[PDB]
Structure 1
């Protein structure tokens, strides 16, 4: 079942429907950007649509192909955004072509927007009735000088991933630096090529036996010292 309130479900029974409104939120905090709020249309005052107090500005956005299924391939709906004045290209050249971000689609009925969107003022406003979905941007299939097409995907979709992440190595580590297994917290001692530096900005392990010996954590080495198992 869905988290649909009783009031909106009851309203979604009558013949004389209201106007469906779709609003989009592009979240880039996890990738290094900001939160952008878009709406396909504006109110009667020629103003950004106000919902839950926040404002969605008008911009041509169109999402097509939302197909949830359990078999076959995954779902890859398409989002089209007008690229005029180079606005999309500006963030694309900066945010690595909008790869890894999140998109949230909220759909609302017209009779529940804030009262400031209507000259008479809606008395039926209720800023808690909407339907929410989230997806992740996969690629920018085409961004011309007039438009831009993004492919969407489910966050939990598996593609190109293998289950047994463990890999057996001979003289190379397998985990990160200082994360969980390299319980190192002392001063910087080494760098990429195992040089005796003492600066923290250049401290990165070489993923070798010599790096471990330098950092005195050879007891936590991921590379088994077999090597000569296939020669004999």
Structure 2
């Protein structure tokens, strides 16, 4: 069971109910963009729908195919949003196809919606009632002048992952440079072609033994030297 609030359950039980609103939020902070809020309808006063303080904007967007099943493959829902005016194109050329960002979906009954929306106000307004679920954009299946279609996926997907993941190599270091495991923090020394330099912008390790010797960090070398003698 999801820990749904009691008033939402009471609303679900009743025979005659209020409108069900889905409030889409597309988050591009991890990729490097801004977070965008969309909703399918305007409110009763012809203004953007106001939930808490967010004020989601009106825009034709639909998401279908959501499911909760662990027996077979992953779920892979689908989200369709229109770009007649070229917004999705502007986001995709810039933020590299909107691949990797988060999509958050909220389902709130219109009974609990904020009092700003209705012309006569709402006496039952309660901002705590919503049902939230998070997904991650996976691909842009289509992009046209009429619409654009994305396919979402679960944040925890196991398509390209292999467990042990760490390879024993004879001549190449697998660590990340200046990371936790390499443990190097000092002046810029060399380039990625083992050419001396001092600018901090173009300092990169070549993952070679000479590249590591430039740092005098041979102790933390990722690879295991002289294996190829035994493997032979």
TM over 0.5: yes
| Per-residue deviation, residues 12-70 of structure 1 (Å, max 9, x unmatched) | 11100110000001011111000100000010111000011220000000000001211
Q: Give the superposition deviation at 1:174.
A: 0.4
Residue ranges of structure 2 left out of the alignment (5+ in a row): none
| Per-residue deviation, residues 106-155 of structure 1 (Å, max 9, x unmatched) | 00001111111111111000011010011000000001111000000000
| Per-residue deviation, residues 163-202 of structure 1 (Å, max 9, x unmatched) | 0111010110001011111111110001110101011000
Q: Which residue of 2 aligns with 1:30?
A: 30
Q: Give the superposition deviation at 1:228.
A: 3.3
Structure 1 CA distance, aligned partners of 2:118 and 2:181? 59
Give the secondary-structure state (helix, strand or coil) at the position aligned to 1:54. Answer: coil
| Per-residue deviation, residues 86-120 of structure 1 (Å, max 9, x unmatched) | 11100100000000000000000011111111111
Q: Which moved more, 1:220-229 or 1:107-116?
A: 220-229
Structure 1 CA distance, aligned partners of 2:169 and 2:78? 41
What's the TM-score, normalizing by structure 1?
0.98
Q: Give the superposition deviation at 1:222.
A: 1.1
Q: Which residue of 1 aligns with 2:88?
A: 88
Aligned residues: 232
Structure 2 CA distance, aligned partners of 1:86 and 1:230? 60
Change (3 A) 1:12 1:169: same
Contact 2:82 2:146 in 1 (8 A): yes
Change (3 A) 1:82 1:231: closer
Q: Which runs of 4+ in 1 moved over 2 A?
A: 226-232
Q: Give the superposition deviation at 1:227.
A: 3.7
Contact 2:170 2:228 in 1 (8 A): no
What's the TM-score, normalizing by structure 2?
0.98
Structure 2 CA distance, aligned partners of 1:199 and 1:116? 55
Structure 2 CA distance, aligned partners of 1:39 and 1:205? 47
Contact 2:170 2:223 in 1 (8 A): yes
Kindly report the root-mean-square deviation, in angstroms, between the aligned alpha carbons of the 2 structures. 1.0
Structure 2 CA distance, aligned partners of 1:67 and 1:122? 33
Residue ranges of structure 1 left out of the alignment (5+ in a row): none
Change (3 A) 1:36 1:231: closer
Q: Give the superposition deviation at 1:231.
A: 6.2
